[PDB]
């Protein structure tokens, strides 16, 4: 297909909740070498976000049913799923590295993709062992921090993508870097700063995200 | 080791990996040894899900594509993707129908299993019908009907009217009558008849039996109500 038939099919796949098909088309569209529009950028994220999501919950369940045990079929199936999963993260990371991350000028685009690279290194960190864990945590952090730097420098505290970044970086703090106080701090600040500037917005976008921030706040700053 | 396959199928269930689960179960069954009651369900559940979500995709695309009746026309894209999903669904169904023919359907032994697998054959033809152009469609609808009818005959003779398998069969068969076969009277008659004969025998069922029978009965009466309004 040409670059436009992939992109509407991906949109059809989305409607159909055929999320791996969606990812397949989105990967193909990106490999036609041309910059992604803003909504196309969101199709790519949604595609892989959903594929990996199912793999992560599968892995989470299989790991639960393993740490107790305390036969081999469990470890094996966990390993099959880990491998599929990493397979998928490596594929997004390769796609980010080779076509997306900086054939860019926009503060938004550079931040979107870096947020994504933070995200998919983070998924890999959850599954990692212990140097190539330390190593991918480091990478995720670097990806997120650099997106954080740019977005502070160049975007408003209500920008939906900047909020998504803070949201996720604060989840990384809490869940990956065992840094609860950094996570609660980052979530609080981000909420408060976005709240302060809400009146200026055409914004259910920012608002939706603000809620997930608070939700996390509630869960974390709590017994 | 089928022991391993069955094990990973149960693992795949918990983790909601239904392709996998259905693959483990396709394996197990291909070892040639019969399938216990629980393993019957793992097979059923595994494929129920792969198909069901494939059905859902197809319905979404069939709807988009079926209008497209002229804000249009991103036409080529839509039709081809529906057809891709189609062949894919059709392959799963055939795989299930294959398993049934090439291993699972038998003369033997147990009556609950024979009815179960012939009920499954009918369900999976039925899924194929929902998607079919025909005749070839009047053709697959027949095959659904024949399978269901072979299960019906067996359960009527070899099972009591309250049986959860016999009831689920009657239930599905009656839905197939109304939804697919354009035989709403057959559907109603069968659903009422099934429900009443269960009801009249419910009294002879021990404490630890009826919650299952009665739950399907509630689904039979529901449909009856809906098919009268």
Coordinates of N, CA, C and O in Angstrom, one line a residue, chain A residues 38-182, unseen atoms left out:
Chain A
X38 N 0.5 15.1 14.0 CA 0.2 15.0 15.5 C -0.8 13.8 15.8 O -0.7 13.1 16.8
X39 N -1.9 13.7 15.0 CA -2.9 12.6 15.2 C -2.4 11.2 14.8 O -2.8 10.2 15.4
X40 N -1.5 11.2 13.8 CA -0.8 9.9 13.4 C 0.1 9.5 14.5 O 0.2 8.3 14.8
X41 N 0.8 10.4 15.2 CA 1.6 10.2 16.3 C 0.9 9.5 17.4 O 1.4 8.7 18.1
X42 N -0.4 9.9 17.6 CA -1.3 9.3 18.6 C -1.7 7.9 18.2 O -2.0 7.1 19.1
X43 N -1.9 7.7 16.9 CA -2.2 6.3 16.5 C -1.1 5.3 16.8 O -1.4 4.3 17.4
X44 N 0.1 5.7 16.5 CA 1.3 4.9 16.8 C 1.4 4.6 18.3 O 1.6 3.4 18.7
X45 N 1.2 5.6 19.2 CA 1.3 5.4 20.6 C 0.2 4.5 21.1 O 0.4 3.6 21.9
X46 N -1.1 4.7 20.6 CA -2.2 3.9 21.0 C -2.1 2.4 20.6 O -2.4 1.5 21.3
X47 N -1.6 2.2 19.3 CA -1.3 0.9 18.8 C -0.4 0.1 19.7 O -0.8 -0.9 20.3
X48 N 0.8 0.6 20.0 CA 1.8 -0.1 20.8 C 1.4 -0.1 22.2 O 1.8 -1.1 22.9
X49 N 0.8 0.9 22.7 CA 0.4 1.1 24.1 C -0.5 -0.1 24.5 O -0.5 -0.5 25.6
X50 N -1.4 -0.5 23.5 CA -2.3 -1.5 23.7 C -1.8 -2.9 23.5 O -2.1 -3.8 24.3
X51 N -0.9 -3.1 22.6 CA -0.2 -4.4 22.4 C 0.6 -4.7 23.6 O 0.4 -5.7 24.2
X52 N 1.5 -3.8 24.0 CA 2.4 -4.0 25.1 C 1.5 -4.2 26.4 O 1.8 -5.0 27.3
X53 N 0.5 -3.3 26.5 CA -0.4 -3.4 27.7 C -0.9 -4.8 28.0 O -0.7 -5.3 29.1
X54 N -1.4 -5.5 27.0 CA -1.9 -6.8 27.2 C -0.8 -7.8 27.6 O -0.9 -8.7 28.4
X55 N 0.4 -7.6 27.0 CA 1.6 -8.4 27.3 C 2.1 -8.1 28.7 O 2.6 -9.1 29.4
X56 N 2.0 -6.9 29.2 CA 2.4 -6.5 30.5 C 1.5 -7.1 31.6 O 2.0 -7.6 32.6
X57 N 0.2 -7.1 31.4 CA -0.7 -7.7 32.3 C -0.6 -9.2 32.3 O -0.8 -9.8 33.4
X58 N -0.3 -9.8 31.2 CA -0.1 -11.2 31.1 C 1.1 -11.6 31.8 O 1.1 -12.5 32.7
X59 N 2.2 -10.9 31.6 CA 3.4 -11.1 32.3 C 3.2 -10.9 33.8 O 3.7 -11.6 34.6
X60 N 2.5 -9.8 34.2 CA 2.3 -9.5 35.6 C 1.6 -10.7 36.3 O 2.0 -11.2 37.3
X61 N 0.6 -11.3 35.6 CA -0.1 -12.4 36.1 C 0.7 -13.7 36.2 O 0.7 -14.4 37.2
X62 N 1.5 -13.9 35.2 CA 2.4 -15.1 35.1 C 3.5 -15.0 36.2 O 4.0 -16.0 36.7
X63 N 3.9 -13.8 36.5 CA 5.0 -13.7 37.4 C 4.5 -13.8 38.8 O 5.2 -14.4 39.7
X64 N 3.3 -13.3 39.1 CA 2.6 -13.6 40.3 C 2.5 -15.1 40.5 O 3.0 -15.6 41.5
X65 N 2.0 -15.8 39.6 CA 1.9 -17.2 39.6 C 3.2 -17.8 39.2 O 3.4 -18.3 38.2
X66 N 4.2 -17.6 40.1 CA 5.6 -18.1 39.9 C 6.4 -17.8 41.2 O 7.0 -18.7 41.8
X67 N 6.4 -16.5 41.6 CA 7.1 -16.1 42.8 C 6.5 -16.9 44.0 O 7.1 -17.1 45.1
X68 N 5.3 -17.5 43.7 CA 4.8 -18.6 44.5 C 4.2 -19.6 43.5 O 3.3 -19.1 42.8
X69 N 4.6 -20.8 43.3 CA 5.9 -21.5 43.6 C 7.0 -21.0 44.5 O 8.0 -20.4 44.0
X70 N 7.0 -21.3 45.8 CA 8.1 -21.1 46.7 C 7.9 -21.9 48.0 O 7.2 -22.9 48.0
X71 N 6.4 -27.7 38.8 CA 6.9 -27.9 37.5 C 7.4 -26.6 36.8 O 7.1 -25.5 37.3
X72 N 8.1 -26.7 35.7 CA 8.8 -25.6 34.9 C 7.9 -24.8 33.9 O 8.3 -23.8 33.5
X73 N 6.7 -25.3 33.7 CA 5.8 -24.8 32.6 C 5.5 -23.3 32.8 O 5.4 -22.5 31.8
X74 N 5.4 -22.9 34.1 CA 5.2 -21.5 34.4 C 6.4 -20.6 34.0 O 6.1 -19.6 33.3
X75 N 7.6 -20.9 34.4 CA 8.8 -20.1 34.0 C 8.9 -20.0 32.5 O 9.2 -19.0 31.9
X76 N 8.6 -21.1 31.8 CA 8.7 -21.2 30.3 C 7.7 -20.3 29.6 O 8.1 -19.5 28.7
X77 N 6.5 -20.3 30.1 CA 5.4 -19.5 29.5 C 5.7 -18.0 29.8 O 5.5 -17.1 29.0
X78 N 6.1 -17.7 31.1 CA 6.6 -16.4 31.4 C 7.7 -15.9 30.5 O 7.7 -14.7 30.0
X79 N 8.6 -16.8 30.2 CA 9.7 -16.4 29.3 C 9.3 -16.2 27.9 O 9.8 -15.3 27.2
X80 N 8.3 -17.0 27.4 CA 7.8 -16.8 26.0 C 7.1 -15.4 25.9 O 7.3 -14.7 25.0
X81 N 6.4 -15.0 27.0 CA 5.7 -13.7 27.0 C 6.7 -12.5 27.2 O 6.5 -11.5 26.5
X82 N 7.6 -12.6 28.2 CA 8.7 -11.6 28.3 C 9.3 -11.4 26.9 O 9.5 -10.2 26.6
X83 N 9.6 -12.4 26.2 CA 10.4 -12.3 25.0 C 9.5 -11.6 23.9 O 10.1 -10.8 23.2
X84 N 8.3 -12.0 23.7 CA 7.3 -11.3 22.9 C 7.3 -9.8 23.2 O 7.4 -9.0 22.4
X85 N 7.2 -9.6 24.5 CA 7.1 -8.2 25.1 C 8.3 -7.4 24.7 O 8.2 -6.3 24.1
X86 N 9.5 -7.9 25.0 CA 10.7 -7.2 24.7 C 10.8 -7.0 23.2 O 11.2 -5.9 22.8
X87 N 10.5 -8.0 22.5 CA 10.4 -8.0 21.1 C 9.7 -6.7 20.7 O 10.2 -6.0 19.8
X88 N 8.5 -6.5 21.3 CA 7.7 -5.3 20.9 C 8.3 -4.0 21.3 O 8.3 -3.0 20.6
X89 N 8.9 -3.9 22.5 CA 9.6 -2.7 23.0 C 10.8 -2.3 22.1 O 10.9 -1.2 21.7
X90 N 11.7 -3.3 21.9 CA 12.8 -3.2 21.0 C 12.3 -2.6 19.6 O 13.0 -1.7 19.0
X91 N 11.2 -3.1 19.1 CA 10.7 -2.7 17.8 C 10.3 -1.2 17.8 O 10.5 -0.5 16.8
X92 N 9.6 -0.7 18.9 CA 9.3 0.7 19.0 C 10.5 1.5 19.2 O 10.7 2.5 18.6
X93 N 11.4 1.0 20.1 CA 12.7 1.7 20.3 C 13.5 1.8 19.0 O 14.2 2.9 18.8
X94 N 13.5 0.8 18.2 CA 14.2 0.9 16.9 C 13.6 1.9 16.0 O 14.3 2.5 15.2
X95 N 12.3 2.0 16.0 CA 11.5 2.8 15.2 C 11.7 4.3 15.6 O 11.8 5.2 14.7
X96 N 11.7 4.5 16.9 CA 12.0 5.8 17.4 C 13.4 6.2 17.1 O 13.6 7.3 16.7
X97 N 14.4 5.3 17.2 CA 15.8 5.6 17.0 C 16.0 5.9 15.5 O 16.8 6.8 15.2
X98 N 15.4 5.2 14.6 CA 15.8 5.3 13.2 C 14.9 6.2 12.3 O 15.4 6.7 11.3
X99 N 13.7 6.5 12.7 CA 12.8 7.4 11.9 C 12.1 8.6 12.7 O 11.7 9.5 12.0
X100 N 12.0 8.5 14.0 CA 11.1 9.4 14.7 C 11.9 10.5 15.5 O 11.6 11.7 15.3
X101 N 12.7 10.0 16.4 CA 13.1 10.9 17.5 C 13.7 12.2 17.2
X102 N 14.7 12.3 16.2 CA 15.0 13.7 15.8 C 15.3 13.8 14.3 O 16.4 14.1 13.8
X103 N 14.2 13.5 13.5 CA 14.0 14.3 12.3 C 12.9 15.2 12.7
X104 N 13.2 16.0 13.7 CA 12.2 16.9 14.4 C 12.8 18.3 14.7 O 14.0 18.5 15.0
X105 N 11.9 19.2 14.7 CA 12.1 20.6 15.2 C 11.2 20.9 16.4 O 11.6 21.4 17.4
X106 N 9.9 20.6 16.2 CA 8.9 20.9 17.2 C 9.3 20.5 18.6 O 9.9 19.4 18.8
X107 N 9.1 21.3 19.6 CA 9.3 21.0 21.0 C 8.3 19.8 21.4 O 8.8 18.9 22.1
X108 N 7.1 19.9 20.9 CA 6.1 18.8 21.1 C 6.7 17.4 20.6 O 6.7 16.4 21.4
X109 N 7.1 17.4 19.3 CA 7.4 16.1 18.7 C 8.7 15.5 19.4 O 8.7 14.3 19.6
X110 N 9.7 16.3 19.6 CA 10.9 15.8 20.3 C 10.5 15.3 21.7 O 11.0 14.3 22.1
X111 N 9.5 15.9 22.3 CA 9.1 15.5 23.7 C 8.2 14.3 23.6 O 8.3 13.4 24.5
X112 N 7.3 14.2 22.6 CA 6.4 13.0 22.5 C 7.3 11.8 22.4 O 7.1 10.9 23.3
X113 N 8.2 11.7 21.4 CA 8.9 10.6 21.2 C 9.9 10.2 22.3 O 10.0 9.0 22.6
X114 N 10.5 11.2 22.9 CA 11.3 11.0 24.1 C 10.5 10.4 25.2 O 11.0 9.6 26.0
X115 N 9.3 10.9 25.4 CA 8.4 10.4 26.4 C 8.1 8.9 26.1 O 8.1 8.1 27.0
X116 N 7.9 8.6 24.8 CA 7.7 7.2 24.3 C 8.9 6.4 24.6 O 8.8 5.3 25.1
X117 N 10.1 6.8 24.3 CA 11.3 6.1 24.6 C 11.5 5.8 26.1 O 12.0 4.7 26.5
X118 N 11.2 6.8 26.9 CA 11.1 6.6 28.4 C 10.2 5.5 28.7 O 10.5 4.6 29.4
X119 N 9.0 5.5 28.1 CA 7.9 4.5 28.3 C 8.3 3.1 28.0 O 8.1 2.2 28.8
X120 N 9.0 2.9 26.9 CA 9.2 1.5 26.4 C 10.5 1.0 27.0 O 10.6 -0.3 27.1
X121 N 11.4 1.8 27.4 CA 12.5 1.4 28.3 C 12.0 1.0 29.6 O 12.5 0.1 30.3
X122 N 10.9 1.7 30.1 CA 10.3 1.4 31.4 C 9.6 0.1 31.4 O 9.8 -0.7 32.3
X123 N 8.9 -0.2 30.3 CA 8.3 -1.5 30.2 C 9.4 -2.6 30.3 O 9.2 -3.6 31.0
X124 N 10.5 -2.4 29.6 CA 11.6 -3.3 29.6 C 12.3 -3.5 31.0 O 12.8 -4.5 31.3
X125 N 12.2 -2.4 31.8 CA 12.8 -2.4 33.1 C 12.0 -3.2 34.1 O 12.6 -4.0 34.9
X126 N 10.7 -3.2 34.0 CA 9.8 -4.0 34.7 C 10.2 -5.5 34.6 O 9.9 -6.3 35.5
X127 N 10.7 -5.9 33.4 CA 10.9 -7.3 33.1 C 12.4 -7.7 33.2 O 12.8 -8.8 33.1
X128 N 13.2 -6.7 33.5 CA 14.7 -6.8 33.4 C 15.2 -7.4 34.7 O 14.6 -7.4 35.8
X129 N 16.4 -7.9 34.7 CA 17.0 -8.8 35.7 C 17.9 -8.0 36.7 O 17.5 -7.9 37.9
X130 N 19.0 -7.4 36.3 CA 19.8 -6.7 37.2 C 21.2 -6.2 36.8 O 22.1 -6.2 37.6
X131 N 21.4 -5.8 35.5 CA 22.4 -4.9 35.1 C 21.8 -4.2 33.9 O 21.8 -3.0 33.8
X132 N 21.4 -5.1 33.0 CA 20.4 -4.7 32.0 C 19.1 -4.4 32.7 O 18.1 -4.4 32.0
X133 N 19.0 -4.3 34.0 CA 17.9 -3.6 34.6 C 18.4 -2.2 35.0 O 17.8 -1.2 34.5
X134 N 19.4 -2.1 35.8 CA 20.1 -0.8 36.1 C 20.4 0.0 34.8 O 20.2 1.2 34.8
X135 N 20.7 -0.8 33.8 CA 21.1 -0.1 32.5 C 19.9 0.5 31.8 O 20.0 1.5 31.1
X136 N 18.7 -0.2 31.9 CA 17.5 0.3 31.1 C 16.7 1.3 32.0 O 16.1 2.2 31.4
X137 N 16.8 1.2 33.3 CA 16.3 2.2 34.2 C 17.0 3.5 33.9 O 16.3 4.5 33.6
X138 N 18.3 3.5 33.9 CA 19.2 4.6 33.5 C 18.7 5.2 32.2 O 18.5 6.4 32.1
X139 N 18.6 4.4 31.2 CA 18.1 4.9 29.9 C 16.7 5.5 29.9 O 16.5 6.6 29.5
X140 N 15.8 4.8 30.5 CA 14.4 5.4 30.7 C 14.5 6.8 31.4 O 13.9 7.7 30.9
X141 N 15.2 6.9 32.4 CA 15.4 8.1 33.2 C 16.0 9.2 32.3 O 15.5 10.4 32.3
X142 N 17.0 8.9 31.5 CA 17.6 9.8 30.6 C 16.7 10.3 29.5 O 16.6 11.5 29.2
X143 N 15.9 9.4 29.0 CA 14.8 9.7 28.0 C 13.8 10.7 28.6 O 13.4 11.7 28.0
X144 N 13.3 10.3 29.8 CA 12.3 11.1 30.5 C 12.9 12.5 30.9 O 12.2 13.5 30.8
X145 N 14.1 12.5 31.5 CA 14.6 13.8 32.0 C 14.8 14.7 30.8 O 14.6 15.9 31.0
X146 N 15.2 14.2 29.7 CA 15.5 15.1 28.5 C 14.2 15.6 28.0 O 14.2 16.7 27.5
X147 N 13.1 14.8 28.0 CA 11.8 15.3 27.6 C 11.4 16.3 28.6 O 10.7 17.3 28.3
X148 N 11.6 16.1 29.9 CA 11.3 17.0 31.0 C 12.0 18.4 30.8 O 11.3 19.4 30.8
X149 N 13.3 18.3 30.5 CA 14.0 19.5 30.3 C 13.4 20.4 29.1 O 13.2 21.6 29.3
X150 N 13.2 19.7 28.0 CA 12.6 20.4 26.8 C 11.3 21.0 27.1 O 11.0 22.2 26.8
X151 N 10.4 20.2 27.7 CA 9.0 20.6 27.9 C 8.9 21.7 28.9 O 8.0 22.6 28.7
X152 N 9.8 21.8 29.9 CA 9.8 23.0 30.8 C 10.3 24.2 30.0 O 9.6 25.2 30.0
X153 N 11.4 24.0 29.3 CA 11.9 25.1 28.5 C 10.9 25.7 27.4 O 10.9 26.9 27.2
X154 N 10.1 24.8 26.8 CA 9.4 25.2 25.6 C 7.9 25.0 25.5 O 7.3 25.2 24.5
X155 N 7.3 24.5 26.6 CA 5.8 24.2 26.5 C 5.1 24.7 27.8 O 5.8 24.9 28.8
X156 N 3.8 24.9 27.7 CA 3.0 25.4 28.9 C 2.6 24.2 29.8 O 2.3 23.1 29.3
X157 N 2.5 24.4 31.1 CA 2.2 23.4 32.1 C 0.9 22.7 31.9 O 0.6 21.7 32.6
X158 N 0.1 23.2 31.0 CA -1.2 22.6 30.6 C -1.1 21.7 29.3 O -2.1 21.0 29.0
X159 N 0.0 21.8 28.6 CA 0.1 21.0 27.4 C -0.1 19.5 27.7 O 0.6 19.0 28.5
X160 N -1.0 18.9 27.0 CA -1.4 17.5 27.2 C -0.3 16.5 27.2 O -0.2 15.6 28.0
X161 N 0.6 16.7 26.2 CA 1.8 15.8 26.1 C 2.8 16.0 27.2 O 3.3 15.0 27.8
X162 N 3.0 17.3 27.6 CA 3.8 17.5 28.8 C 3.2 16.9 30.0 O 4.0 16.5 30.9
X163 N 1.9 16.9 30.1 CA 1.2 16.3 31.3 C 1.4 14.8 31.3 O 1.7 14.2 32.3
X164 N 1.2 14.2 30.1 CA 1.4 12.7 29.9 C 2.8 12.4 30.3 O 3.0 11.4 31.0
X165 N 3.8 13.2 29.9 CA 5.2 13.0 30.3 C 5.4 13.0 31.8 O 6.0 12.1 32.4
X166 N 4.9 14.0 32.4 CA 5.0 14.1 33.9 C 4.3 12.9 34.6 O 4.9 12.3 35.4
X167 N 3.1 12.6 34.1 CA 2.4 11.5 34.6 C 3.3 10.3 34.6 O 3.5 9.7 35.7
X168 N 3.8 9.9 33.4 CA 4.6 8.7 33.3 C 5.9 8.7 34.0 O 6.3 7.8 34.6
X169 N 6.6 9.9 34.0 CA 7.9 10.0 34.7 C 7.7 9.8 36.2 O 8.5 9.3 36.9
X170 N 6.5 10.3 36.6 CA 6.2 10.2 38.1 C 5.8 8.7 38.4 O 6.0 8.3 39.5
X171 N 5.3 8.0 37.4 CA 5.0 6.6 37.6 C 6.3 5.8 37.7 O 6.5 4.9 38.5
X172 N 7.2 6.1 36.7 CA 8.6 5.6 36.7 C 9.3 5.9 38.1 O 9.9 4.9 38.6
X173 N 9.1 7.1 38.6 CA 9.7 7.3 40.0 C 9.1 6.3 41.0 O 9.8 5.6 41.6
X174 N 7.8 6.3 41.1 CA 7.1 5.5 42.1 C 7.4 4.0 41.9 O 7.9 3.3 42.8
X175 N 7.1 3.5 40.7 CA 7.1 2.1 40.4 C 8.5 1.4 40.0 O 8.7 0.2 40.1
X176 N 9.4 2.2 39.5 CA 10.6 1.7 38.9 C 11.9 2.1 39.6 O 12.7 1.3 39.9
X177 N 12.0 3.4 40.0 CA 13.1 3.9 40.7 C 12.9 3.9 42.3 O 13.7 4.4 43.0
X178 N 11.9 3.2 42.8 CA 11.6 3.2 44.2 C 11.8 4.6 44.8 O 12.5 4.7 45.8
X179 N 11.3 5.7 44.2 CA 11.4 7.0 44.7 C 10.0 7.7 44.9 O 9.7 8.6 44.2
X180 N 9.2 7.2 45.9 CA 7.9 7.7 46.2 C 7.8 9.2 46.4 O 6.9 9.8 45.9
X181 N 8.7 9.8 47.1 CA 8.7 11.2 47.4 C 8.9 12.0 46.1 O 8.3 13.1 46.0
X182 N 9.8 11.6 45.3 CA 10.0 12.2 44.0 C 8.8 12.1 43.1 O 8.4 13.1 42.5

